[PDB]
mmCIF file of C-alpha atoms in Angstrom:
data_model
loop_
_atom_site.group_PDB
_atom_site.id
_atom_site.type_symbol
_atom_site.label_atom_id
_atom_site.label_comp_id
_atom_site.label_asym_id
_atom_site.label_seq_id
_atom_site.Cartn_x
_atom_site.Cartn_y
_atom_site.Cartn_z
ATOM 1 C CA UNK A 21 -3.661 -76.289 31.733
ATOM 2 C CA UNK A 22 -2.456 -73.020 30.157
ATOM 3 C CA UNK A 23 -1.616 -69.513 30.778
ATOM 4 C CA UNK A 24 -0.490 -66.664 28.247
ATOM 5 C CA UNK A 25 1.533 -63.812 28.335
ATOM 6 C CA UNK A 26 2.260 -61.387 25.581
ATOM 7 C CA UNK A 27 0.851 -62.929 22.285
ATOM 8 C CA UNK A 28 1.751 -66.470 22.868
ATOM 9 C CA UNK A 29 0.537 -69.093 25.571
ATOM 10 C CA UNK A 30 2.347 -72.232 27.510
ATOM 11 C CA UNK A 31 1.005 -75.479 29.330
ATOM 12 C CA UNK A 32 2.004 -75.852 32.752
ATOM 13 C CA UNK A 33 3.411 -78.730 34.757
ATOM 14 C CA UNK A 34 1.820 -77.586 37.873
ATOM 15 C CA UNK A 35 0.999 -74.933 40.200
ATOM 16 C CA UNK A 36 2.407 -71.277 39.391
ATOM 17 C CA UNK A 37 2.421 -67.888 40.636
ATOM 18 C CA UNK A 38 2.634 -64.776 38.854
ATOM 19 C CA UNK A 39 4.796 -61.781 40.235
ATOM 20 C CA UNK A 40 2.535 -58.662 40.949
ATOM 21 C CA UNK A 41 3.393 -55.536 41.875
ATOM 22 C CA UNK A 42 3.696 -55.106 45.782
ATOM 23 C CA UNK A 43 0.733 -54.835 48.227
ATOM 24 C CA UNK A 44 2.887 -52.832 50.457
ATOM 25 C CA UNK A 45 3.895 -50.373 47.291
ATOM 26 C CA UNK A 46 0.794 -50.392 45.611
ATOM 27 C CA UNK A 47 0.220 -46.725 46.976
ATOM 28 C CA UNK A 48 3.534 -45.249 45.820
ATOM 29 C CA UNK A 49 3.046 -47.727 42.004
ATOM 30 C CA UNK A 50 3.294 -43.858 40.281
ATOM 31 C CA UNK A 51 7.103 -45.148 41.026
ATOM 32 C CA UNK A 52 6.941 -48.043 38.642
ATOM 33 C CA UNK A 53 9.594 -49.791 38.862
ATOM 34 C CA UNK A 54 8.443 -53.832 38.682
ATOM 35 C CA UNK A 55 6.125 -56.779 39.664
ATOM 36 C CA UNK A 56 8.072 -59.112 42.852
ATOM 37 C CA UNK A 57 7.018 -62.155 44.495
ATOM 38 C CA UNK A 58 8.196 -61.110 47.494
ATOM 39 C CA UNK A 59 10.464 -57.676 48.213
ATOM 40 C CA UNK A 60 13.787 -59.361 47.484
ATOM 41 C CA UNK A 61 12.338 -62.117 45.190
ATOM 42 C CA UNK A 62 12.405 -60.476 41.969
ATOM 43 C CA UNK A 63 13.063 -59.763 38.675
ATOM 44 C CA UNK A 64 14.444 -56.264 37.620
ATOM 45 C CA UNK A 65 11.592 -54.423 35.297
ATOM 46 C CA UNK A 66 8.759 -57.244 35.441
ATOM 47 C CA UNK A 67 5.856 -54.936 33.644
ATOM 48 C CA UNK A 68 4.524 -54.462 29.906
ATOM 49 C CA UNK A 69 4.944 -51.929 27.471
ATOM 50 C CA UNK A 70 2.532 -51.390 24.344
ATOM 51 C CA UNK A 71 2.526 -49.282 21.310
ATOM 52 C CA UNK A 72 0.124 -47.169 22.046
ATOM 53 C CA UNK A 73 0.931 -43.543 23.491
ATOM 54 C CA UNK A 74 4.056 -45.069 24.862
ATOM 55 C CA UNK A 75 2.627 -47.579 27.888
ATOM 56 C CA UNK A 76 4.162 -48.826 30.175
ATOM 57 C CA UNK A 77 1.460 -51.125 32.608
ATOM 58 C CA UNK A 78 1.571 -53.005 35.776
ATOM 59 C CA UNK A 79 -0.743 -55.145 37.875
ATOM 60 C CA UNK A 80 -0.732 -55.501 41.479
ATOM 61 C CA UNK A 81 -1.783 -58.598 43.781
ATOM 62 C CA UNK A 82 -5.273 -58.402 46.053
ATOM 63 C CA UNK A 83 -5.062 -55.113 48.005
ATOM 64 C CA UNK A 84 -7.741 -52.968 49.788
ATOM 65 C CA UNK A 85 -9.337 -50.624 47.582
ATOM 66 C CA UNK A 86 -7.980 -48.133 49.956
ATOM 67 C CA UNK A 87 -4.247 -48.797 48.383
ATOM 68 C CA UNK A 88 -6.639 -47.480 44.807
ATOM 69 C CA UNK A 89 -7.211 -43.969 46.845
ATOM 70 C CA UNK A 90 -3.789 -44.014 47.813
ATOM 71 C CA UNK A 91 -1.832 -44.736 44.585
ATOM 72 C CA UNK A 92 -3.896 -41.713 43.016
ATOM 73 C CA UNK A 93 -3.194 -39.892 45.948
ATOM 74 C CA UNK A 94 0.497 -40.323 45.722
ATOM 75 C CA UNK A 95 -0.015 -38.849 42.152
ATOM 76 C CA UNK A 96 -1.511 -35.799 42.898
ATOM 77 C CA UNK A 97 0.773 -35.615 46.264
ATOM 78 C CA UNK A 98 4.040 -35.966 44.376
ATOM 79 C CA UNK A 99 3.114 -33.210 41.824
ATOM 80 C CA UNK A 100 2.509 -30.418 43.940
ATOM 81 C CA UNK A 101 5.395 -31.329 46.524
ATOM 82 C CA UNK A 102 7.344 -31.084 42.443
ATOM 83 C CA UNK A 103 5.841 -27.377 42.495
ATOM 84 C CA UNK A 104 6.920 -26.436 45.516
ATOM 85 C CA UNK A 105 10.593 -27.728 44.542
ATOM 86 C CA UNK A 106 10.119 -25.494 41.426
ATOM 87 C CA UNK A 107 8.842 -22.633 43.096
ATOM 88 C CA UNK A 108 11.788 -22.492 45.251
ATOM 89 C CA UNK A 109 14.204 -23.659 42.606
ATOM 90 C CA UNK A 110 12.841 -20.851 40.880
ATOM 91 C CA UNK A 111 14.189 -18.427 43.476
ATOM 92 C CA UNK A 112 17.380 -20.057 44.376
ATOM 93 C CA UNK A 113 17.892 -18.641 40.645
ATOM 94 C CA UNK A 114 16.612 -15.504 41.279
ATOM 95 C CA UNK A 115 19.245 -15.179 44.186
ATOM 96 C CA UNK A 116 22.089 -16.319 41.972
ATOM 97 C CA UNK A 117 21.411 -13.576 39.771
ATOM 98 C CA UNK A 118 21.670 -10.733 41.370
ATOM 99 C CA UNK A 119 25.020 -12.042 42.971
ATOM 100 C CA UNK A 120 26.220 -11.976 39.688
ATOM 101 C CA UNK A 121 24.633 -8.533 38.667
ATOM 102 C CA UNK A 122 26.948 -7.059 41.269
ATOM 103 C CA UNK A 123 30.034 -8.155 39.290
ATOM 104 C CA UNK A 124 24.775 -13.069 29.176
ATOM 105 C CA UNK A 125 25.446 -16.568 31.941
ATOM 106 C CA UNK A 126 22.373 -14.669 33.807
ATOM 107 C CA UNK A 127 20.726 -14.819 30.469
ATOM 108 C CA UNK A 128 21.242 -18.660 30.065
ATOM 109 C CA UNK A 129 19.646 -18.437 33.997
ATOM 110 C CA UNK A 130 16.367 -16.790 33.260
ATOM 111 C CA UNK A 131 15.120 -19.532 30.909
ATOM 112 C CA UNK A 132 15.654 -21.991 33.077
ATOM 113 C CA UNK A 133 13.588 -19.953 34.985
ATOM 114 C CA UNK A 134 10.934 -18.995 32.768
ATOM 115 C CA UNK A 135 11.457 -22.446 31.040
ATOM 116 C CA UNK A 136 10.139 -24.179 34.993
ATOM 117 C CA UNK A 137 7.927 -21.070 35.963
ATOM 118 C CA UNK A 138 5.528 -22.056 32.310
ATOM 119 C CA UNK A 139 6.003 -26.060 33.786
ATOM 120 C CA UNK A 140 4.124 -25.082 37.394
ATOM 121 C CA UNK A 141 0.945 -25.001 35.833
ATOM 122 C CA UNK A 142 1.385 -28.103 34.183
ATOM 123 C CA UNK A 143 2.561 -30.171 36.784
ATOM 124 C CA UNK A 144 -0.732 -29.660 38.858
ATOM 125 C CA UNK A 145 -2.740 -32.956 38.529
ATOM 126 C CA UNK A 146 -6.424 -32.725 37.600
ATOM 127 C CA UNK A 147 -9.141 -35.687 37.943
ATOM 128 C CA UNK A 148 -10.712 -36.196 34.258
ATOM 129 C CA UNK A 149 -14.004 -37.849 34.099
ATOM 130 C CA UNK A 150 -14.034 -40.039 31.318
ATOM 131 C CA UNK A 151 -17.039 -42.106 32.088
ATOM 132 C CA UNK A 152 -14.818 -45.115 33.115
ATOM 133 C CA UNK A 153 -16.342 -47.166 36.270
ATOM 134 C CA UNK A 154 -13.859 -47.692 39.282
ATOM 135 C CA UNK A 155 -11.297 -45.566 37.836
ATOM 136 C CA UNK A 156 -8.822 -42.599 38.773
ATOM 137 C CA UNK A 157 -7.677 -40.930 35.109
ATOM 138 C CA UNK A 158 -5.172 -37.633 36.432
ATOM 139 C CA UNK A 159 -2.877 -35.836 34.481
ATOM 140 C CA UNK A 160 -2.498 -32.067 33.649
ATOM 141 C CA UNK A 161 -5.517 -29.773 32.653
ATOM 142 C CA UNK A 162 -5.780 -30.258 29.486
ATOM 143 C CA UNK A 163 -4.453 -34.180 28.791
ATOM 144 C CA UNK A 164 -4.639 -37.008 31.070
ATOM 145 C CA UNK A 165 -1.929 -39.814 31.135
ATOM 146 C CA UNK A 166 -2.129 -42.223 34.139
ATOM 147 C CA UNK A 167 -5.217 -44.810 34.921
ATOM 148 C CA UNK A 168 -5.680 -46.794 37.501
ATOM 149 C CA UNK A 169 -8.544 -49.492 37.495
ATOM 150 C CA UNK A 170 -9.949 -50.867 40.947
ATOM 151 C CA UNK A 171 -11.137 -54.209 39.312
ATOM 152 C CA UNK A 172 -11.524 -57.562 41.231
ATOM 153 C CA UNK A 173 -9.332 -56.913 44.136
ATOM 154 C CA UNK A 174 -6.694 -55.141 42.140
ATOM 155 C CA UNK A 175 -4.940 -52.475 40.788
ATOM 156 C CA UNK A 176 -4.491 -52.025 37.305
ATOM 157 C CA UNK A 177 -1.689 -49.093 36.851
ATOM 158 C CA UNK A 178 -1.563 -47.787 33.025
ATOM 159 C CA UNK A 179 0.673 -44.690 32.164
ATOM 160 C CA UNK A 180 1.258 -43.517 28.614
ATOM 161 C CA UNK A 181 4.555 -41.910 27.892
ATOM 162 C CA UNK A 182 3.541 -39.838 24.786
ATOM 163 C CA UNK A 183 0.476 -38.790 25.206
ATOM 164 C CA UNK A 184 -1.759 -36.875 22.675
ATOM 165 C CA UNK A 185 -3.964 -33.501 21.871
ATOM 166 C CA UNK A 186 -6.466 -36.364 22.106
ATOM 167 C CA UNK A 187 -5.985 -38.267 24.795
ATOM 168 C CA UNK A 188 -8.724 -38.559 26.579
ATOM 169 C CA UNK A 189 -10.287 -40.303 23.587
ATOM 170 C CA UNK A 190 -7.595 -42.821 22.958
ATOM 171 C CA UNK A 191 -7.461 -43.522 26.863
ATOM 172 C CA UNK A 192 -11.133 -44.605 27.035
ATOM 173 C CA UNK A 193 -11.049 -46.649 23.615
ATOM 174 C CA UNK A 194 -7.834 -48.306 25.003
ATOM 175 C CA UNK A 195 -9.510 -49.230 28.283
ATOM 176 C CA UNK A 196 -12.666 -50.418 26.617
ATOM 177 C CA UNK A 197 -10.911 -53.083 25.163
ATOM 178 C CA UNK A 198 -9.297 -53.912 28.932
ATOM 179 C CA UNK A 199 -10.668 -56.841 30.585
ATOM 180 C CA UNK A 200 -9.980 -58.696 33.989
ATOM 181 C CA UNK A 201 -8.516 -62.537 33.230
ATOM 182 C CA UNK A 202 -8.033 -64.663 35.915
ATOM 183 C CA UNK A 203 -5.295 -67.435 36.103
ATOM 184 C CA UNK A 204 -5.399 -70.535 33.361
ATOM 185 C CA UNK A 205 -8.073 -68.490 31.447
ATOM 186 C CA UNK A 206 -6.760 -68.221 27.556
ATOM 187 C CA UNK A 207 -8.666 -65.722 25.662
ATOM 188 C CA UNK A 208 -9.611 -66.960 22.179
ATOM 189 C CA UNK A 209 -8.914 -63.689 20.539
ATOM 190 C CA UNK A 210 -6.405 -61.978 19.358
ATOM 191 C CA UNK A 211 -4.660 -59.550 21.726
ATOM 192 C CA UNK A 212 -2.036 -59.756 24.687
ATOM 193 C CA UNK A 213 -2.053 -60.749 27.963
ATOM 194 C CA UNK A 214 -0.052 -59.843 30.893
ATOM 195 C CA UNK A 215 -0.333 -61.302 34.777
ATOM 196 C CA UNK A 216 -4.630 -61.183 35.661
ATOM 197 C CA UNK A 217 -5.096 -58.836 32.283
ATOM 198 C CA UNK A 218 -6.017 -58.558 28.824
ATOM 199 C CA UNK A 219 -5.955 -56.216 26.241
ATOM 200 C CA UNK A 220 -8.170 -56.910 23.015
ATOM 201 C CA UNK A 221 -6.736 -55.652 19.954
ATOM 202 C CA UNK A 222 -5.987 -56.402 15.656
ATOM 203 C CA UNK A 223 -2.807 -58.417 16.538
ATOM 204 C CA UNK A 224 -1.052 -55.837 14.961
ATOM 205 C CA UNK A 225 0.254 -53.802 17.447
ATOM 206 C CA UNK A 226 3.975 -53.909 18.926
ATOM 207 C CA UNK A 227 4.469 -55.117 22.623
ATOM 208 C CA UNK A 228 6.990 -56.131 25.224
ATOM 209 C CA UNK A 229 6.565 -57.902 27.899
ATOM 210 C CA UNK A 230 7.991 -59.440 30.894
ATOM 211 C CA UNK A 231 7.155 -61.754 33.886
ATOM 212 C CA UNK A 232 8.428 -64.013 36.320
ATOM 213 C CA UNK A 233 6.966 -67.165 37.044
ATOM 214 C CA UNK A 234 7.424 -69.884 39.739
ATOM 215 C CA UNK A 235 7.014 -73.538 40.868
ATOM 216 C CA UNK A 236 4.249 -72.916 43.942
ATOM 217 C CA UNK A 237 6.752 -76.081 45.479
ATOM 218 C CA UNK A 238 9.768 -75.132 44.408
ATOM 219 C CA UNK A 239 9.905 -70.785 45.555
ATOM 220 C CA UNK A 240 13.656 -70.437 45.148
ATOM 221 C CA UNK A 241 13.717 -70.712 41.406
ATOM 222 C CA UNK A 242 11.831 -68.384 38.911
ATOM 223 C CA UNK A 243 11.327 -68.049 35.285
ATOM 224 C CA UNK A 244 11.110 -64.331 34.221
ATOM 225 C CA UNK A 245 9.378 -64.708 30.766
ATOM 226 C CA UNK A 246 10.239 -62.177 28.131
ATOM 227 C CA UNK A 247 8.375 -61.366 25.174
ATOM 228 C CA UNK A 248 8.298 -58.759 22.226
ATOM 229 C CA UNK A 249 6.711 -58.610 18.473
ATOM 230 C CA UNK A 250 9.081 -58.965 15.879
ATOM 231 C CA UNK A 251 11.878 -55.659 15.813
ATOM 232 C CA UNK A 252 10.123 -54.056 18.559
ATOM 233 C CA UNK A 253 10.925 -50.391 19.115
ATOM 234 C CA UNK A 254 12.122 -50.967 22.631
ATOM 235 C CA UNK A 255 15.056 -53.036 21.157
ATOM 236 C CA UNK A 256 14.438 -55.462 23.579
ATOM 237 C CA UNK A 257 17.769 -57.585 24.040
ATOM 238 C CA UNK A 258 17.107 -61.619 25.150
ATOM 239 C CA UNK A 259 18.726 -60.273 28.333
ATOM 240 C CA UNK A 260 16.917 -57.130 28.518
ATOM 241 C CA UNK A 261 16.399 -56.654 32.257
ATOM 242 C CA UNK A 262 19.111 -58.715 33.310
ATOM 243 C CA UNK A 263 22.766 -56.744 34.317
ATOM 244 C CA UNK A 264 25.748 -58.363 35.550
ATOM 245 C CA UNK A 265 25.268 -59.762 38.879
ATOM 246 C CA UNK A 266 23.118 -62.850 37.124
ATOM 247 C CA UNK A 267 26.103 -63.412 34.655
ATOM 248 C CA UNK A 268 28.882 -63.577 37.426
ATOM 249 C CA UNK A 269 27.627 -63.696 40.771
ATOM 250 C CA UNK A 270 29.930 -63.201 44.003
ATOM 251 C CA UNK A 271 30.883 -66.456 46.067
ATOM 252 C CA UNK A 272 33.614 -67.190 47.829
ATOM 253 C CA UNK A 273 35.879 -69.093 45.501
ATOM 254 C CA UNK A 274 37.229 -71.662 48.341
ATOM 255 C CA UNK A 275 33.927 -73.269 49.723
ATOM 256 C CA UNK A 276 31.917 -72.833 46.353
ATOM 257 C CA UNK A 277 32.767 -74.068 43.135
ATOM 258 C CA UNK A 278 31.396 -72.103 40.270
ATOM 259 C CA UNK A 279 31.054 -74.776 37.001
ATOM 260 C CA UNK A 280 29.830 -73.303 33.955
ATOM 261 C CA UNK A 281 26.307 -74.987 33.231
ATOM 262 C CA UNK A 282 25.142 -76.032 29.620
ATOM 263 C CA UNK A 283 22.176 -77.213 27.897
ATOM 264 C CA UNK A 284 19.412 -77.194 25.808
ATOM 265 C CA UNK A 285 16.002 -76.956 25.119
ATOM 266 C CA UNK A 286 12.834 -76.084 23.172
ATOM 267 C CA UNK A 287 10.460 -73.326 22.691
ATOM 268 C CA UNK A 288 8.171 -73.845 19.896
ATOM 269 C CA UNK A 289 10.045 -76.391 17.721
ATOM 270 C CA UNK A 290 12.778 -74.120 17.224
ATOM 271 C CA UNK A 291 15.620 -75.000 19.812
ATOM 272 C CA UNK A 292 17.629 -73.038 21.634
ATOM 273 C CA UNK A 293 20.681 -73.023 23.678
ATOM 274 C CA UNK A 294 20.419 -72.703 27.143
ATOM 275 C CA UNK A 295 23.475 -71.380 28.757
ATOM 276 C CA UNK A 296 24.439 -69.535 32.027
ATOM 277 C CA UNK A 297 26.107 -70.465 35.454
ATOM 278 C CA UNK A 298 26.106 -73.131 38.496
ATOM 279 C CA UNK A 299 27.016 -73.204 41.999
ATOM 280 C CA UNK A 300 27.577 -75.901 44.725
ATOM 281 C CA UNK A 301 29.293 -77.122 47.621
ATOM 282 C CA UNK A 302 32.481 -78.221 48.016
ATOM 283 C CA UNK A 303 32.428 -81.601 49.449
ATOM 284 C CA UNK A 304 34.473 -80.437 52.771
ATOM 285 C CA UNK A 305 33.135 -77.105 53.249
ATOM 286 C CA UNK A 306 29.799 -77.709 55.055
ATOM 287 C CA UNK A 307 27.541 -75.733 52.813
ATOM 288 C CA UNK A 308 23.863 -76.441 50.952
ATOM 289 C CA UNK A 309 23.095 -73.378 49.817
ATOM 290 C CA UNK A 310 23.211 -73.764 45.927
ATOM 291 C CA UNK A 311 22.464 -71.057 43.172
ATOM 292 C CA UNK A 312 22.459 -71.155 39.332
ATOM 293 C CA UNK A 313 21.134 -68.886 36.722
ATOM 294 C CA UNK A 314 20.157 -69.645 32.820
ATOM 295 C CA UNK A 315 19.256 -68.082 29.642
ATOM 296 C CA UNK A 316 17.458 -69.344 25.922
ATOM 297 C CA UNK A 317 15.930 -67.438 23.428
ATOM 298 C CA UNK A 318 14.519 -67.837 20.154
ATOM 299 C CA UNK A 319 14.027 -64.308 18.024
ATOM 300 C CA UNK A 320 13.093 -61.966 17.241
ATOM 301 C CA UNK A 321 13.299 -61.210 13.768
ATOM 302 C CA UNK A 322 10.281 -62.788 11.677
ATOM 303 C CA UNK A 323 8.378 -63.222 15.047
ATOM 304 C CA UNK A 324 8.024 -62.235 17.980
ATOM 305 C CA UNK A 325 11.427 -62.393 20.297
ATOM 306 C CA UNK A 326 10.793 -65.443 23.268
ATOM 307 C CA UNK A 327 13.301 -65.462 26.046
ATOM 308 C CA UNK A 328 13.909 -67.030 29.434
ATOM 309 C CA UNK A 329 15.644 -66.176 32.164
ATOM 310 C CA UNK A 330 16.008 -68.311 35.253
ATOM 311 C CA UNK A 331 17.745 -67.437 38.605
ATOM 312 C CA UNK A 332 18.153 -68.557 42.033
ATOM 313 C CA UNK A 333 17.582 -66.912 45.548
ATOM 314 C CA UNK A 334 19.055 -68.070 48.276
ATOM 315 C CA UNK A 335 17.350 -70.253 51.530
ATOM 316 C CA UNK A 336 16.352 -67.316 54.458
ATOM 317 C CA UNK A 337 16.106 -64.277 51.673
ATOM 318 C CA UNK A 338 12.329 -63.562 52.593
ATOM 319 C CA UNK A 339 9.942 -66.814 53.577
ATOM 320 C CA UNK A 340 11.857 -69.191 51.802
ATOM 321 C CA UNK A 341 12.802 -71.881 54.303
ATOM 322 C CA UNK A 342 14.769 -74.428 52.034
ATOM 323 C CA UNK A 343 17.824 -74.256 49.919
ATOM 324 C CA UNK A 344 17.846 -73.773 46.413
ATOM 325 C CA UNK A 345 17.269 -77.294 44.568
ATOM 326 C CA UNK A 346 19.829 -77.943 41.814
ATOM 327 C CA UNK A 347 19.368 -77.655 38.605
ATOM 328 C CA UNK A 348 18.363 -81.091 37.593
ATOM 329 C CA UNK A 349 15.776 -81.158 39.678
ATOM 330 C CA UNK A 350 14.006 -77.547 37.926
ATOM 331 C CA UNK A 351 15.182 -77.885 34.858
ATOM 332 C CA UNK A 352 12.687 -80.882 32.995
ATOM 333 C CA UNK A 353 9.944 -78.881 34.134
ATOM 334 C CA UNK A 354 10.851 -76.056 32.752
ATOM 335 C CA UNK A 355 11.648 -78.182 29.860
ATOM 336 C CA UNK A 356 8.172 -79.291 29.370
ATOM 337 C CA UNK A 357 6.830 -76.026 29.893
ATOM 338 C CA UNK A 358 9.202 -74.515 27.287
ATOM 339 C CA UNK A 359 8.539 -76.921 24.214
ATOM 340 C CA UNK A 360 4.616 -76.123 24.542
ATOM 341 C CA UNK A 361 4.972 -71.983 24.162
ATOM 342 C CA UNK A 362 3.123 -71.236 20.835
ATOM 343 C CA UNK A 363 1.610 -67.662 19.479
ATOM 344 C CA UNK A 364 -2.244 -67.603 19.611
#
C-alpha cells in the first residue's frame, strides 16, 4: 500500500492525504507560493522543481474547471495591469527629468526608461497553440513559459524559469511525457512523481521535491517529505523550507514546558537521527494543547538527499477539533513508514 514522491516510494500505515494547492487560490496559482491542507495547515514551499528550463510545478485539489479559465486569466490580467504600472512608471521618469533639466544622473534615468519602454511589449501575454488537449500555454510573443493542464478535476500549474529560443518544442515534449496518477498508484518506470502526477523520463535528470503528508485520523501532525537527486543545483538543505519558528517556537515559559525531544529512526537501512523540539502541560496549569516538531535526513551526496520534517498545529487552527496527540502516539507510524522509503 504505496505511494511515491520524487524518485523513491514508501508503504503506508494507513490513510493519507496529500497537500494540494488551494481550491480557493487556484485562480491566482500564477502566485506560486505552495500546496496546504488547509489555509493555515501548511508547509512553507510544498511544490517541485525539475531540471528542465528551470520548473517549478504545482498541483491543485478537485476544482471547477472554471478555476482553469481563471488561473490563465489571472496571467494575462496581471501582465497588462504590469504595463500599465510601466507605462506610468515610465512617465513618473519623464517628470523627474525635466525637474532636473531646470538645474549625466538624467542619463542613468533614460535607460531605465528605455530599458522598461523595450519590456512593454514583452510583458503582453499571448495564447500559443501547441496542439496540447485541455491546456492554456501563455507567455510572450515569441516564447511561451507557463502551462496549465485541466486533467481529472485538476489543475496542473507548470512554469519554466529559463526558458528557450525553442520553447515551444521542449514544452510539448515535456508534457507528452506528463501523465495523471491517482493515489497508491506506483508507476513501474523510471521518472518522478509528485502529489496526483507523473513525469516519465531517463532517470537522469535532477529534481527537488517537497510534500506534506498526513494521518487522515490524526490532522494535527504532518510529514512534509523532502527530496532531491544527488548535489542538486537548488542546494537543497535537509531543512530547506523550514525557518526559525519550527526550531524555537513561542510559548509561554510558565504553563508550558519546552523538553528537547530525541530519537531515531530509519529511512532505507541507513539510520538517521531524529532530533527537534517538544511541548506539554504543566501538571497545574490546566492546558492540553501540545506541539512538537522533528527532523531526519539521510543525503545527499551519492544519492538522492531524503528528509523529514514533522510539525504540529494547534486544536481550533482551521477544522481541527482535537489537540495535538503527543509524540509517542505519531511517532511508530511514522517509524514504519520511514524504514520502507526506497528509490524505484
Amino acid at each position: 500500500y504505496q505511494e511515491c514522491l520524487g524518485r523513491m516510494t514508501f508503504e503506508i500505515p494507513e490513510e493519507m492525504e496529500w497537500a494540494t494547492y488551494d481550491a480557493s487560490r487556484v485562480w491566482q496559482i500564477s502566485k506560486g507560493g505552495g500546496h496546504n491542507f488547509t489555509a493555515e495547515v501548511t508547509a512553507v514551499g510544498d511544490n517541485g522543481s525539475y531540471d528542465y528550463d528551470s520548473m517549478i510545478f504545482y498541483v491543485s485539489e478537485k476544482v471547477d474547471k472554471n478555476e482553469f479559465h481563471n488561473a490563465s486569466n489571472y496571467i494575462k490580467g496581471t501582465a497588462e495591469i504590469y504595463q500599465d504600472h510601466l507605462r506610468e512608471n515610465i512617465k513618473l521618469d519623464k517628470k523627474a527629468i525635466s525637474t532636473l533639466q531646470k538645474n549625466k544622473s538624467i542619463e542613468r534615468i533614460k535607460k531605465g526608461i528605455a530599458e522598461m519602454e523595450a519590456k512593454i511589449p514583452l510583458a503582453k501575454i499571448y495564447e500559443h497553440d501547441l496542439g496540447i488537449p485541455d491546456s492554456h500555454i501563455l507567455g510572450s510573443k515569441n516564447i511561451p513559459f507557463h502551462v496549465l493542464l485541466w486533467r481529472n478535476q485538476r489543475v496542473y500549474y507548470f512554469t519554466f524559469s529559463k526558458p528557450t529560443e525553442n520553447s515551444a518544442q521542449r514544452i510539448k515534449d515535456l508534457i507528452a511525457r506528463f501523465r495523471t496518477r491517482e493515489l497508491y498508484e506506483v508507476p513501474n518506470e523510471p521518472g518522478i512523481c509528485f502529489p496526483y502526477g507523473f513525469i516519465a523520463d531517463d532517470g537522469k535528470t535532477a529534481y527537488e521535491l517537497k510534500n506534506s503528508l498526513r494521518f487522515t485520523r490524526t490532522p494535527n501532525v504532518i510529514f512534509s517529505l523532502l527530496t532531491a537527486s544527488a548535489n542538486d543545483p537548488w542546494q537543497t538543505r535537509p531543512t530547506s523550507g523550514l525557518y526559525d519558528s519550527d526550531f524555537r517556537p513561542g510559548y509561554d515559559r510558565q504553563k508550558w514546558k519546552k523538553s528537547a525531544l530525541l530519537d531515531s529512526l530509519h529511512i532505507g537501512k541507513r539510520l538517521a537521527a531524529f532530533e527537534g523540539w517538544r511541548l506539554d502541560p504543566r501538571p497545574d496549569s490546566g492546558e492540553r494543547e501540545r506541539a512538537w516538531f522533528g527532523l531526519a535526513h539521510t543525503g545527499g551526496t551519492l544519492d538522492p538527499l531524503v528528509a523529514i520534517q514533522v510539525q504540529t498545529f494547534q486544536k481550533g487552527t482551521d477544522d481541527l477539533t482535537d489537540y495535538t496527540p503527543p509524540p509517542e502516539e505519531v511517532l511508530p507510524r511514522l517509524k514504519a513508514l520511514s524504514q520502507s522509503i526506497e528509490q524505484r
